[PDB]
Design a protein around this ligand. Structure first.
Ligand SMILES: [Zn+2]
Ligand SMILES: [Zn+2]
Length: 728
């Protein structure tokens, strides 16, 4: 069904072929190539023979890729600062897994401009599905950099497409990296991606997939997208490995940690051969899970000429160290970018990495706190990611707390499981199924190695699944008032955005549905952003009718009134807001913002809203934080907040197109989560705090009055709550 002719292929005489092994179509310059270049059709040919003529470091390659595309004479790209691995701009994924995710949904739908079109980027990406392969295959990482040039072809506005994309790739590979042209293949491999799909190439060189070229043009035959998006992905680590020729990708990227851990653990350094042959066959042979670690192991055993026991003896220490190295790097990005360990979402993933890593250290027989290993990452990488230096104290503290709290979790967890194993055993069970091993982790925090020595110690079975961790990983992703009769109406003019001191107004009745009145313009605040609705009255025929609720549906606001029969379509009414109720909310809402700037500064940049609610008497703010707020910190925050009131800084607002706002102010805007619209409403407290926000704010901080913090409470692991009161 899929085409894939390109101008380059035609002009340069590339041949389209069906692979003899996988049957799939691929393009080649080699008249003698019969296979697609992709394991198991072909094999890694570069271990001990770098296929890139000179050795590169991560830093060297990243810059090389970014430079080439930035300085291109026919298609220059804007260079774009990587985004956090924690997607603040969307609420549907836990972690960034791919550079394209920076630009979903808003840029692709056209609702937000690209930062630059076309753009070039190097995006740290995290993938938990490969986790059980890390340190075992020689090429899988939790955390890796995806380099990409992207182009967003909006209708009427071509940038570039397939012809240019494969010319660009081929140029970068052949002119910049000096790879052999007759050794590169472009394999056709249609792509489906959840939401959308299109034709794709895999670029293959000496058996390694060095790049993915994807042309998005269908969304959920399927259904053709309006915007055509060039979505590339080049693996930094794979490219570095292709230039080093080391027995594993880990020795090429994580040396600064692999070696230190070998020395400390003091481990009998392996026959290099075994490590080379493992990676070789691990290519040819995916862990499609099932039970095939055991077939991989048997295979490398026969090739090196030893038993699986002596193999396991020799490799395991390497497997452990590779995994610790990878997992700690991933935890540095995650924590730096704002992940607080916990039992939910990315906190749960951070916690999983911490616990998995600690157990690897214990299986090595290494007595070294995990934080020390993170420190190595901070030392090597802060040059190119300054944020690691800035966050260092918080990152290391979070690790130490988790390490310390893990030691207790384990003693009481051991006792608790041992008892419920014995229960299962006198219930005629001698196995323990996947599901229950998962639950043991999920609710007692024990990893399957621990369970098994407890279990076999009273006649019950260990059977740790090869894919245990990628399983547990899947768990992190847990889980109308008035409709449609509105769509045909104009957006309500929000007078409270023009003047948040407007207490009276005039307007025209557009609809009366049941007991909700709909105006053409209103100064009544609709519920949202933790700010309750205004109340007040509407006046019609000299008849005052109380407003008791004010909600928003799309862009149309509805007023709940006590007497719907007083109003008819076309009637002119006189609005009058309850000023006391409004003024107390304004104080609490702006207070909440004064607060957030104080919390961030006293606790740290990882501080993110998690919940927020205000009333006429008190407000509360829930935040992501990794420990109790101490009495002293409480007072430190209250002081700092009160200093900003007394200082009377300007509070201002403006609308900005989404990508502009983000690029000026960073992703801190997205506190209450994420807001639709081509343009967003930015509330700013001068040199203090800045937020994408819908509510009504005071012009000045002075107008908030004294801010008294009432108390603090834990809500759950990772979430602390602060309750305060504003005004004199
Ligand atoms: Zn093939
Ligand atoms: Zn707000």
């Amino acid at each position: 069904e899929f085409i894939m002719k390109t101008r380059m292929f035609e002009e340069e005489g590339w041949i389209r072929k069906k692979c003899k092994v996988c049957g799939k179509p691929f393009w080649t310059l080699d008249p003698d190539r019969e296979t697609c270049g992709d394991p198991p059709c072909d094999e890694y040919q570069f271990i001990g023979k770098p296929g890139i003529p000179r050795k590169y470091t991560l830093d060297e390659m990243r810059e090389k890729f970014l430079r080439f595309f930035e300085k291109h004479e026919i298609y220059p790209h804007g260079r774009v600062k990587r985004y956090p691995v924690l997607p603040r701009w969307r609420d549907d994924v836990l972690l960034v897994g791919a550079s394209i995710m920076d630009f979903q949904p808003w840029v692709i739908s056209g609702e937000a401009d690209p930062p630059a079109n076309p753009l070039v980027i190097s995006q740290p990406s995290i993938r938990f599905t490969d986790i059980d392969n890390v340190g075992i295959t020689g090429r899988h990482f939790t955390i890796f950099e995806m380099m990409a040039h992207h182009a967003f072809n909006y209708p009427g506005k071509p940038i570039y497409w397939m012809d240019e994309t494969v010319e660009l790739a081929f140029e970068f590979f052949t002119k910049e990296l000096k790879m052999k042209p007759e050794d590169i293949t472009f394999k056709e491999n249609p792509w489906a991606g959840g939401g959308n799909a299109g034709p794709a190439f895999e670029v293959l060189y000496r058996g390694l997939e060095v790049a993915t070229l994807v042309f998005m043009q269908y969304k959920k035959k399927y259904i053709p997208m309006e915007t055509k998006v060039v979505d590339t992905g080049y693996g930094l680590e794979r490219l570095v490995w292709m230039s080093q020729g080391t027995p594993t990708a880990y020795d090429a990227v994580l040396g600064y940690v692999v070696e230190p851990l070998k020395k400390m653990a003091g481990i009998e350094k392996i026959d290099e051969k075994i490590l080379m042959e493992n990676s070789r066959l691990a290519g040819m042979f995916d862990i499609e899970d099932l039970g095939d670690l055991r077939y991989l192991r048997e295979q490398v055993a026969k090739r090196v000429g030893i038993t699986v026991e002596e193999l396991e003896k020799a490799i395991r220490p390497y497997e452990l160290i590779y995994a610790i190295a990878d997992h700690t790097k991933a935890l540095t990005f995650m924590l730096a970018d704002g992940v607080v360990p916990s039992n939910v979402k990315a906190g749960y993933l951070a916690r999983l990495l911490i616990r998995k890593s600690i157990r690897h250290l214990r299986e090595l027989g290494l007595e070294v706190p995990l934080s020390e290993i993170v420190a190595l990452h901070i030392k090597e990488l802060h040059k190119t990611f300054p944020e690691f230096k800035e966050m260092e104290d918080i990152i290391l503290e979070m690790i130490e707390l988790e390490e310390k709290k893990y030691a207790e979790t384990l003693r009481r967890g051991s006792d608790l499981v041992r008892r419920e194993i014995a229960k299962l055993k006198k219930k005629g069970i001698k196995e323990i199924p996947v599901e229950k091993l998962v639950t043991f982790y999920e609710s007692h925090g024990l990893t399957p190695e621990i369970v098994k020595e407890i279990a076999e110690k009273e006649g019950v079975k260990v059977n740790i699944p090869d894919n245990f961790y990628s399983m547990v990983a899947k768990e992190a992703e847990r889980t109308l008032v008035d409709f449609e009769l509105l769509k045909d109406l104009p957006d309500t003019r929000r007078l409270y955005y023009e003047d948040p001191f407007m207490k009276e107004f005039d307007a025209k009745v557009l609809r009366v549905i049941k007991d909700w009145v709909i105006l053409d313009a209103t100064a009544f605040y609709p519920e949202g952003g933790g700010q309750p609705y205004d109340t007040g009255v509407l006046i019609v025929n000299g008849r005052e009718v109380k407003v008791t609720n004010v909600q928003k549906v799309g862009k149309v606001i509805i007023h709940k009134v006590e007497d719907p029969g007083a109003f008819k379509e076309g009637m002119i009414v006189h609005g009058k807001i309850d000023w006391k109720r409004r003024i107390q909310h304004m104080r609490h809402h702006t207070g909440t913002h004064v607060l957030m700037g104080a919390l961030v500064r006293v606790l740290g940049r990882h501080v993110w809203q998690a919940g927020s609610q205000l009333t006429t008497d008190w407000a509360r703010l829930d935040i992501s934080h990794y420990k109790r707020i101490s009495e002293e910190e409480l007072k430190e925050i209250e002081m700092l907040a009160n200093r900003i009131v007394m200082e009377d800084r300007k509070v201002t607002w403006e609308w900005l197109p989404r990508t502009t706002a983000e690029q000026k102010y960073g992703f801190r805007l997205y506190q209450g989560g994420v807001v639709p619209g081509r343009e967003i409403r930015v509330v700013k407290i001068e040199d203090w705090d800045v937020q994408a926000c819908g509510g009504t704010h005071l012009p000045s901080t002075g107008l908030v009055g004294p801010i008294k913090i009432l108390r603090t409470e834990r809500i759950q692991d990772g979430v602390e709550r602060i309750i305060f009161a504003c005004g004199e």
